[PDB]
């Protein structure tokens, strides 16, 4: 069973801006996803301090970067808190309506696209490089779900019968044809060092 949803008009607008604005500094997408992963890992870590059973779905708190040149995908995996069905539908747990509004106001007053993450809508920077994004997620309080969107105003949600993950979020970037540099090991290392050097969790870059 696949449910199709319309993005709120503001989010559809934000996505169209990201996809259609000329902006060469696309590499910032990765730091935005690593930042989201790090936030989700902080959440599970903090909740686990009063309830250790929250880590029964996995004790390791980490980030994996998985390039696949055959599929032309870059996948960002974490073992953070994950998201419920309600969170996914509600703009992947972001303050997207108010954040978009504030972001647009900032862009009028001298901000640029790289500042997207300051407004809580950094996830959408995935569309700088990806023609389609798949989000697989597992929260302790819910079952596993796949969110998907190629933009164009809509997204889908279905139950994911997996590859079960114990807990966390997997972001699969189906890269645009001209963005395959982000599958190269030396390029990924360079971007992690430039923008995400000092992060509170291990980042493992998988080799092919
Ligand atoms: C898709 C994107 C928004 C994203 C989400 C997560 C995620 O699971 N969460 C849950 C959570 C709880 C508190 C604070 C932030 C977050 C983000 C993720 O792990 C990675 C992502 O790219």
Swiss-Prot record:
Residues 1-208 are annotated as: Interaction with NR3C1. Changing residue 78 to A: Impaired ATP-binding. Strong interaction with HIF1A, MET, KEAP1 and RHOBTB2. Loss of interaction with HSF1 and ERBB2. Los of interaction with TSC1. It is found in: Nucleus; Cytoplasm; Melanosome; Cell membrane. The modification N6-acetyllysine is found at residues 43, 69. Transmembrane segments: none annotated. ATP binds at residues 36, 78, 97, 123. Signal peptide: none annotated. ISGylated. S-nitrosylated; negatively regulates the ATPase activity and the activation of eNOS by HSP90AA1. Homodimer. Identified in NR3C1/GCR steroid receptor-chaperone complexes formed at least by NR3C1, HSP90AA1 and a variety of proteins containing TPR repeats such as FKBP4, FKBP5, PPID, PPP5C or STIP1. Forms a complex containing HSP90AA1, TSC1 and TSC2; TSC1 is required to recruit TCS2 to the complex. The closed form interacts (via the middle domain and TPR repeat-binding motif) with co-chaperone TSC1 (via C-terminus). Interacts with TOM34. Interacts with TERT; the interaction, together with PTGES3, is required for correct assembly and stabilization of the TERT holoenzyme complex. (Microbial infection) Interacts with herpes simplex virus 1 protein US11; this interaction inhibits TBK1-induced interferon production. Molecular chaperone that promotes the maturation, structural maintenance and proper regulation of specific target proteins involved for instance in cell cycle control and signal transduction. Undergoes a functional cycle that is linked to its ATPase activity which is essential for its chaperone activity. This cycle probably induces conformational changes in the client proteins, thereby causing their activation. Interacts dynamically with various co-chaperones that modulate its substrate recognition, ATPase cycle and chaperone function. The TPR repeat-binding motif mediates interaction with TPR repeat-containing proteins like the co-chaperone STUB1. Belongs to the heat shock protein 90 family. This is Heat shock protein HSP 90-alpha. The chain holds residues 16 to 223 of 732 of the full protein.
């Amino acid at each position: 069973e696949v449910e199709t949803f319309a993005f709120q008009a503001e989010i559809a607008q934000l996505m169209s801006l990201i996809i259609n604005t000329f902006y060469s500094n696309k590499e910032i997408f990765l730091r935005e996803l690593i930042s989201n992963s790090s936030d989700a890992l902080d959440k599970i870590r903090y909740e686990s301090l009063t309830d250790p059973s929250k880590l029964d779905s996995g004790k390791e708190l980490h980030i994996n970067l998985i390039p696949n040149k055959q599929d032309r995908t870059l996948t960002i995996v974490d073992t953070g808190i994950g998201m419920t069905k309600a969170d996914l539908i509600n703009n992947l747990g972001t303050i997207a309506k108010s954040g978009t509004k504030a972001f647009m106001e900032a862009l009028q007053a001298g901000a640029d696209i790289s500042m997207i993450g300051q407004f809580g809508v950094g996830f959408y920077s995935a569309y700088l490089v990806a023609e389609k994004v798949t989000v697989i997620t597992k929260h302790n309080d819910d079952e596993q779900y796949a969110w998907e969107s190629s933009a164009g105003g809509s997204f889908t949600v279905r139950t994911d019968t997996g590859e079960p993950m114990g807990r966390g979020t997997k972001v699969i970037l189906h890269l645009k044809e001209d963005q395959t540099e982000y599958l190269e090991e030396r390029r990924i290392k360079e971007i992690v060092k430039k923008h995400s050097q000092f992060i509170g969790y291990p980042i493992t870059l998988f080799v092919e």
